[PDB]
From a paper:
A key component in the generation of cellular energy is the F1Fo ATP synthase, a biological rotary motor that converts proton motive force (pmf) to adenosine tri-phosphate (ATP) in both oxidative phosphorylation and photophosphorylation. The enzyme is based on two rotary motors, termed F1 and Fo, that are coupled together by two stalks: a central rotor stalk and a peripheral stator stalk. The central stalk is comprised of subunits ε and γ and rotates during the enzyme’s catalytic cycle. [name] and other related bacteria exploit an internal subunit, termed ε, that can sense the environment and inhibit the enzyme under certain conditions.
Here we present cryo-EM data showing [name] F1Fo ATP synthase in different rotational and inhibited sub-states, observed following incubation with 10 mM [name]. Masked 3D classification focusing on the central rotor highlighted sub-states in which the εCTD adopted either a condensed down conformation or an extended half-up conformation. In this study we observed the εCTD in two conformations, a half-up and a down sub-state. Strikingly, the improved detail in this study shows that the transition of the εCTD to a down sub-state is associated with a substantial torsional flexing of the central stalk, as evident by rotation of the εNTD about the γ subunit. The sub-states of State 2 showed the best detail for the two εCTD conformations and allowed the c subunits to be assigned to Fo rotational sub-states based on their interaction with the εNTD, assuming that the c-ring remains bound during rotation, which is likely because the interface between the ring and central rotor has a buried surface of ~1200 Å230. When the State 2 εCTD half-up and down structures were compared additional clear differences beyond the εCTD up and down conformation were observed. When aligned on the stator a subunit, the Fo ring rotates the equivalent of two c subunits in a clockwise direction when viewed from the membrane (akin to the synthesis direction). This rotation of the Fo motor was facilitated mainly by a twisting of the central stalk (~50°), but also by flexing of the peripheral stalk (~15°), with the remainder facilitated by small rearrangements within the complex. When the εCTD is in the down conformation, the central stalk is no longer stabilized by the εCTH1:γ interaction, likely increasing its torsional freedom, and the εNTD rotates relative to the γ subunit. When the εCTD subunit is in the down conformation, εCTH1 can no longer bridge between the εNTD and the γ subunit, thereby enabling the complex to open up to an unclamped conformation and allow a greater degree of flexible coupling between the F1 and Fo motors.
Residue numbers in the entry:
A (entry chain X), B (entry chain Y): 1 to 52
C (entry chain Q), D (entry chain I), E (entry chain P), F (entry chain O), G (entry chain N), H (entry chain S), ...: 3 to 79
I (entry chain R): 3 to 78
M (entry chain H): 3 to 136
N (entry chain a): 4 to 269
Amino acid sequence: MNLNATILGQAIAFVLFVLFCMKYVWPPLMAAIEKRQKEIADGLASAERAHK
Amino acid sequence: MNLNATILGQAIAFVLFVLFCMKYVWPPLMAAIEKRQKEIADGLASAERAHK
Amino acid sequence: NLNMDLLYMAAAVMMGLAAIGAAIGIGILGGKFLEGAARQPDLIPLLRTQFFIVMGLVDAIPMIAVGLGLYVMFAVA
Amino acid sequence: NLNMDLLYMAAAVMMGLAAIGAAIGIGILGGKFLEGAARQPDLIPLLRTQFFIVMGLVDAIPMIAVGLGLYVMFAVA
Amino acid sequence: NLNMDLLYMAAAVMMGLAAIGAAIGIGILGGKFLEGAARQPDLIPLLRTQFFIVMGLVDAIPMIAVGLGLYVMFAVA
Amino acid sequence: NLNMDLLYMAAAVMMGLAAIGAAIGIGILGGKFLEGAARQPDLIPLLRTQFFIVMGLVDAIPMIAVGLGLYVMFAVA
Amino acid sequence: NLNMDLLYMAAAVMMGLAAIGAAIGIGILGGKFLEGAARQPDLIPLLRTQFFIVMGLVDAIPMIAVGLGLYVMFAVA
Amino acid sequence: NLNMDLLYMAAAVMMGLAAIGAAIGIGILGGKFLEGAARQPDLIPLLRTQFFIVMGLVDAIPMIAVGLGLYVMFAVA
Amino acid sequence: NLNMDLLYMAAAVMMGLAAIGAAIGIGILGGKFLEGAARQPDLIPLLRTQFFIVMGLVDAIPMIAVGLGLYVMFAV
Amino acid sequence: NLNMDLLYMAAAVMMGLAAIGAAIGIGILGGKFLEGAARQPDLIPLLRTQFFIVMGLVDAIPMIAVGLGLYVMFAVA
Amino acid sequence: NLNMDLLYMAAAVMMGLAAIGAAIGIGILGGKFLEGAARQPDLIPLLRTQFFIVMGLVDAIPMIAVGLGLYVMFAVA
Amino acid sequence: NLNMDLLYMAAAVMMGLAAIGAAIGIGILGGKFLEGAARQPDLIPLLRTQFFIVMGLVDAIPMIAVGLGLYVMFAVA
Amino acid sequence: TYHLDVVSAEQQMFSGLVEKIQVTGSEGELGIYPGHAPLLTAIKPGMIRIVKQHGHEEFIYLSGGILEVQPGNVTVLADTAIRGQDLDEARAMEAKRKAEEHISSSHGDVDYAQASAELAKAIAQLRVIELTKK
Amino acid sequence: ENMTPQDYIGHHLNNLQLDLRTFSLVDPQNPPATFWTINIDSMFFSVVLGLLFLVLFRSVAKKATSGVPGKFQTAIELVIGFVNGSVKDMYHGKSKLIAPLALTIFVWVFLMNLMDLLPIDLLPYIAEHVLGLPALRVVPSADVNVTLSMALGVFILILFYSIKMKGIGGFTKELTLQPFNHWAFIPVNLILEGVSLLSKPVSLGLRLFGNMYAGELIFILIAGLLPWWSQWILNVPWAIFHILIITLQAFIFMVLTIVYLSMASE
């Protein structure tokens, strides 16, 4: 359709949401999940240690 | 063509679309979220039961 | 008259031939997916992820042909 | 007058080519579902789900071609 | 000439390509039914109901083309 | 006036194409019947009954096309 | 004059496509007979029976086309 | 002159399309004979007798078209 | 005039579709020879004989269209 | 200036025929990959590499036809 | 004049139909070789000799068509 | 003038049909390689050698059609 | 030519060099040659034709088995096999009597799966006893 | 109101644009001609949908507990686990970019496609009558410029990863030497590998545009052509189908981005 400068303004909007998502959103979410996965694994290890 | 009439037909077509979301689409997501809180509850509760 | 007429004709040949290409090429590919689903059903979530890779390449070339068909109607008029 | 009178011929080309593409591609795809349904009949409600997934990918380019054909006859001609 | 005779030629292209598409798509699909029905001769009521589920979709898009071809000959021309 | 020569051409396109679809679609479907009667000759009257259920669908769209082609040539032309 | 001349072009497309329909559809069906005869040579008199049953359905439409192609060429001419 | 220059195009459609039908139909049919002779060489003479029976059915309609394509081109000119 | 370019076009449709017909019917036919050859290798001389028997049938119509394609082209 | 009108028609037949060849070629090529993955799923990253090496040859000629046809449509027209 | 443009058009359709027929005809034949070499590489020297004995007759007619396309384009011009 | 209209279209049909034959022929020939790479790993480099021998013969006639469509486009028109 | 070994858990049924054999298979009867296709398969109820040097056939019943033809030493393994003159034409005609009686005396699906095998054993006997006359 | 059905289809296919010279809300009767006429509707709805993505996920990421999650928190970690699981499948490098890039592409392109399901006149009516803007269409991904803006954005990442993870020495060998190997074929290979490089992002944008533009055009046609009593029998079966399209087109732009950035370096 109409060839337009919206391609350039949207490239600023795209980059800024990936920088803020990369720093702020993604490290804290993955921390919270993986910390829970470790708690479950430490539960497995604790059962084996009890019977030993 | 009158345009208010087309918005009426769009209302009928939206109501019927919602009801398909409600009749079949609504269960899969709320089942998955509820089966992820049963999954994460039983993962954590088994770790607590290993502490006991 | 017949300049703007023939532009709609050129989009019909372009979008029609792309509609055969996309439809047939996924028909063949998706039937081979379903026979691997039938043979090893617990493996479907692996093959399905392979089908979407392959299937995306199949349509990529029919979908620039359809996109230019809509360009010739809607932009070129 | 020839300008609109040929557009019905443009729509005929576009939506006829889409009909051969979509019917053959779903016929191939559906044949691999029924043979999957004969090898694993306990399995049909799983495999038929997968059939409606990929059938949705086969029809996507034909259904817009048919839609644009109807548009050419009723909105343009 | 040019008004009436092209509308029959448009109808011929619509209702001929639908004849190619609706016939061969049911031959491909229908042969996998009869081979399944030979391997699993107790399944045939289960496979024919699957065949009717799949057969509806294959015919459905050609039926647009057959009905609209009847419209172009009788209603338009 | 010249117009009447295109009406034989339009029935020619319509009736030849429905002779492609009704001949090959029964060829594909009919060969799978024979293959199932070679391997499983205790099934021949059942497979031959199911073949007539599915063969009725294959030629339906070709039977409309051949009826309209005979109407175009003899009745209209 | 074209009311003579186009009628030979109108018959050529009827007896071209009738010849592609009847020749490919018998080759598909007839080849399925030939593998079944090689695997199950005791059954050849049975399968030949069923081949001639099914073969006459494949030819039902291509002999409408070729009989009208002969009629268009010689009777209307 | 103006009359004859299109009767070489009515001949070219009959003998192009009957040459595709007759060749590919015999290629399908003849390849299935060479399969069965690789299963059972002692039946290479038996299957050969079935091949010439079936092959006469296959190229009967293509020879009505190759005849009338030679009639048109050398007797109507 | 217009008469000659339409003859060169009509020879091109006969002698092209004979090229589809003689090509694909011998791929279908000769591929079944090769798997039969890979299957019964000592029989290759026996199977090759039948391949020429049937090859004469496959080529039979495509050589009518090539003989008329050269006639329409050069002899009229 | 009539010249522009055919050039969009000339671009349409390049990109329509490219989309047929490049979609059905990758459909045949990729469906054989998916049965190879259905057989040997730990090989999949080995067969992906061969599929990407072979898929670049299928798309040699068609990405030229989409290349020059999209040229024709903008640069020349 | 107009005759030369239609002679370039005639040589283009003649060499294009030759290019389809000769390249799909050797891709079938060679795919059967590569499977029978995959079955047993000891017969690579033996099949690859039958391959060329057969592939000569595949290319028999397409090089008459290419030989006359080159003649039209360079010597009828 | 009239020359470039038809001479683009003649190149377009030449490189369009070449885009069919080289894509379909390398699709069939390449998919048989990939079942042989899945079926016989340890032989990928030996089969790849055979695939490049056979691929040079499939691309022969389609590359003459490309080279003369490049000639018609950028030399003759 | 090639050497054929035929065995069952009860006996060695044949062993020696042979010129050609025609053998029951999974989809249908199959013809063998020196350097024939190197193939292993299951076999249907049937028989084997043993054409030896100077062209002398003999006929062995193969009620059930698995085979291998890849090496120059080929092999049939038989779950049951009977030598062509220990069986008789009269014995196979009696086999027809049992199969046809049990067809009349079978009425479900599970018993038809056995009565179908009892029929197949009779039909394969009725085949080899006619071939035995050559 | 003399809306003819053709004119109704016309005005709906006309976005609201603003000139970098006049700053003026153009209307469908006459389109001005310059490059600098931003499509107001697309930018505003795109950032509004991208803001709503970030405001929802931050309102959970700032609080998320490794106990049993709440019923909202569980919906967010389902999508995080789905995105992480698909990246983990098809990417082995250490890069901190690919995982959040894949998340934002999935959830943003999904939210953009979701606009197409709303009744075709609801937001365009309110903007003309209540506000007074001359035109609207509300699906951001149903316009080329944003879909190419994301596809060129992925292109520049394909170049950055291919230069970084293998250097100009390695990138110049793969561009010239494959697929035909010998240095005699180099002049051809730069066209084939060059066009194959360029086709990867061209396929990304035009795959998403062509689905979403022709999807909205069907809702414009059913509303434009068929009388109200009859629209629901053609609109309801299409919206149920287009829920499948909006999800899979979001999923395919994610997956092919990962695959192109992953196979770029390794």
